[PDB]
Amino acid sequence: MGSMERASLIQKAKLAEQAERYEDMAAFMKGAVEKGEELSCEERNLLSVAYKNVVGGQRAAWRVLSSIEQKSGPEVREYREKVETELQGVCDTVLGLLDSHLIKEAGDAESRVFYLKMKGDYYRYLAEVATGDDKKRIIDSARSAYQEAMDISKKEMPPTNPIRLGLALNFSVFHYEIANSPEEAISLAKTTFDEAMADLHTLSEDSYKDSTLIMQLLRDNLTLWT
Amino acid sequence: AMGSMERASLIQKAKLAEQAERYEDMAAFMKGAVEKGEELSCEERNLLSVAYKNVVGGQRAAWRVLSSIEQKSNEEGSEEKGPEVREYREKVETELQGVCDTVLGLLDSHLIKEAGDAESRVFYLKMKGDYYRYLAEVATGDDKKRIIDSARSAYQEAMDISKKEMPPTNPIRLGLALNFSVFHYEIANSPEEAISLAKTTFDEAMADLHTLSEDSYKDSTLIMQLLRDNLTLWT
Amino acid sequence: IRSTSTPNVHM
Amino acid sequence: IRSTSTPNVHM
Ligand SMILES: *CC(=O)NCC1CCN(S(=O)(=O)c2ccc(Br)cc2)CC1
Ligand SMILES: [Cl-]
Ligand SMILES: [Cl-]
Numbered sequence: 001m002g003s004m005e006r007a008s009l010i011q012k013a014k015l016a017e018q019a020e021r022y023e024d025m026a027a028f029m030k031g032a033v034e035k036g037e038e039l040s041c042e043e044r045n046l047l048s049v050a051y052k053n054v055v056g057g058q059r060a061a062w063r064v065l066s067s068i069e070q071k072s073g074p075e076v077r078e079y080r081e082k083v084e085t086e087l088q089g090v091c092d093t094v095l096g097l098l099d100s101h102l103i104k105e106a107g108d109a110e111s112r113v114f115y116l117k118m119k120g121d122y123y124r125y126l127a128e129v130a131t132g133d134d135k136k137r138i139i140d141s142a143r144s145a146y147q148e149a150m151d152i153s154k155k156e157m158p159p160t161n162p163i164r165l166g167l168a169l170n171f172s173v174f175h176y177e178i179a180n181s182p183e184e185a186i187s188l189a190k191t192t193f194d195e196a197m198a199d200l201h202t203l204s205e206d207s208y209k210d211s212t213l214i215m216q217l218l219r220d221n222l223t224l225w226t
Numbered sequence: 227a228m229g230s231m232e233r234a235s236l237i238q239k240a241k242l243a244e245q246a247e248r249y250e251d252m253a254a255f256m257k258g259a260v261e262k263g264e265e266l267s268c269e270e271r272n273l274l275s276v277a278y279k280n281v282v283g284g285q286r287a288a289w290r291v292l293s294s295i296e297q298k299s300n301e302e303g304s305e306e307k308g309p310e311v312r313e314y315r316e317k318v319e320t321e322l323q324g325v326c327d328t329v330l331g332l333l334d335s336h337l338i339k340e341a342g343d344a345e346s347r348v349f350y351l352k353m354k355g356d357y358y359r360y361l362a363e364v365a366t367g368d369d370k371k372r373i374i375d376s377a378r379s380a381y382q383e384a385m386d387i388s389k390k391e392m393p394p395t396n397p398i399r400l401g402l403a404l405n406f407s408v409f410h411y412e413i414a415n416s417p418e419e420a421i422s423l424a425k426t427t428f429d430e431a432m433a434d435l436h437t438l439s440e441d442s443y444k445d446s447t448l449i450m451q452l453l454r455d456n457l458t459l460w461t
Numbered sequence: 462i463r464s465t466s467t468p469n470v471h472m
Numbered sequence: 473i474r475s476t477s478t479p480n481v482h483m
């Protein structure tokens with residue numbers, strides 16, 4: 001990767017996306033990050049889509065195997081452990097990139113909130129498979145990342161901003177699914193939805209489709225949870 | 227290190243991988259099972275085939291997208307575009323070739339010679355024809371000419387056996403004929419042989435339909451319909 | 462039924 | 473439109 005120019009790495013990520021080759025896409029984006037320049041919004045999208053496709057596949061697989069393991073010799077456990085280790089690997093790579101290159105005290109609020117959201121998400125994916133004292137530490141790491149992101153977003157972004165919304169949606173999922181905190185999940189989602197709708201008239205047209213998508217998901221989870 | 231693993235464990239893990247939609251793993255498990263050196267069952271030939279065809283199928287789809295971008299780029303002829311897509315198409319191409327070679331290796335080292343019945347021999351020769359056809363799609367050279375020939379020889383040997391040894395409604399025989407017809411049309415530029423082979427195949431099958439179980443009937447007619455779809459396309 | 466998170470789409 | 477080959481399903 002490091003022998004390729006940054007512009008070629010970005011181009012090859014876009015090609016890999018067109019080819020539905022998400023592992024390659026992610027490796028290309030990791031090489032691009034390693035060049036040491038900030039990512040644009042478009043580039044953050046490429047990074048996010050790539051690694052979420054990869055981990056998404058691993059999560060679906062882990063869930064299938066875990067279900068079988070719970071219903072049902074040594075093979076299922078062995079194979080679930082193999083998939084789990086691979087998932088933890090990808091999560092560690094992402095968290096590594098966030099810590100070593102992407103998260104900074106400087107730069108605009110959008111970027112800072114995005115990367116802290118991402119940090120929360122990938123710790124959350126680690127928490128889905130963790131059991132130990134390890135699980136407790138992992139959960140605290142997810143909570144800490146999400147909370148920092150929430151604090152910045154409340155200070156620096158409008159309530160209907162799609163990054164702020166996606167962060168809040170994901171933190172609400174954390175509360176419900178990871179932290180055994182349904183009251184806080186529902187309260188955060190309801191507050192988020194209402195505050196977003198109260199300021200929707202100020203939102204730029206370029207964000208409207210995205211913000212309405214996330215507010216629909218807040219509504220749907222609220223229906224599910226209540 | 228699958229050499230020391232229980233064969234039954236490898237098969238079980240291939241089935242777990244299938245349920246988890248982990249097709250690379252599934253293929254690797256079935257390779258390990260093949261390498262234990264025993265013949266495969268019907269279920270195992272299905273697992274082997276499904277696993278590797280999912281893997282190569284994804285690679286083929288990606289290669290096709292990339293080749294099209296490459297060609298469109300080159301036609302436009304803009305003096306700054308093109309190197310990246312070529313290089314990435316070559317990368318995917320290399321991976322596809324490697325999977326095909328693995329499958330051909332298994333067929334040659336373990337499966338074709340060791341088959342004890344006509345049905346499974348024909349399935350494996352069909353497979354050999356298919357994986358050479360997948361190689362042919364990305365080949366260019368004199369290399370392309372040698373690979374096309376290898377595919378044809380594998381398919382012809384399968385057809386020769388299946389005509390002597392199997393009913394015309396047998397799904398293996400039908401799938402072989404379907405695929406050999408696609409070879410003629412898409413690879414060997416022989417649309418007439420394609421059409422002829424598809425027509426003969428469909429008609430000989432049709433004649434014997436009345437003999438089949440309810441379940442067998444559904445299997446055979448599925449492939450006959452694709453034979454039909456292709457004839458509608460080729461005329 | 463699991464809760465739905467932010468979808469993996471380009472924003 | 474490409475010709476259809478044998479589908480990748482269990483038979
Ligand atoms: C401007 C900018 O930073 N854009 C890139 C981002 C990538 C995806 N994130 S997100 O994962 O928070 C998200 C939010 C909303 C949607 Br519809 C999808 C993904 C947002 C910004
Ligand atoms: Cl394993
Ligand atoms: Cl490349």
Ligand SMILES: [Mg+2]
Nearest residue numbers: 004005006035
């Ligand atoms: Mg450089």
Ligand SMILES: [Mg+2]
Nearest residue numbers: 081084085129
């Ligand atoms: Mg473990």
Ligand SMILES: [Mg+2]
Nearest residue numbers: 302303304305
């Ligand atoms: Mg130009």
Ligand SMILES: [Mg+2]
Nearest residue numbers: 316319320364
């Ligand atoms: Mg090549």
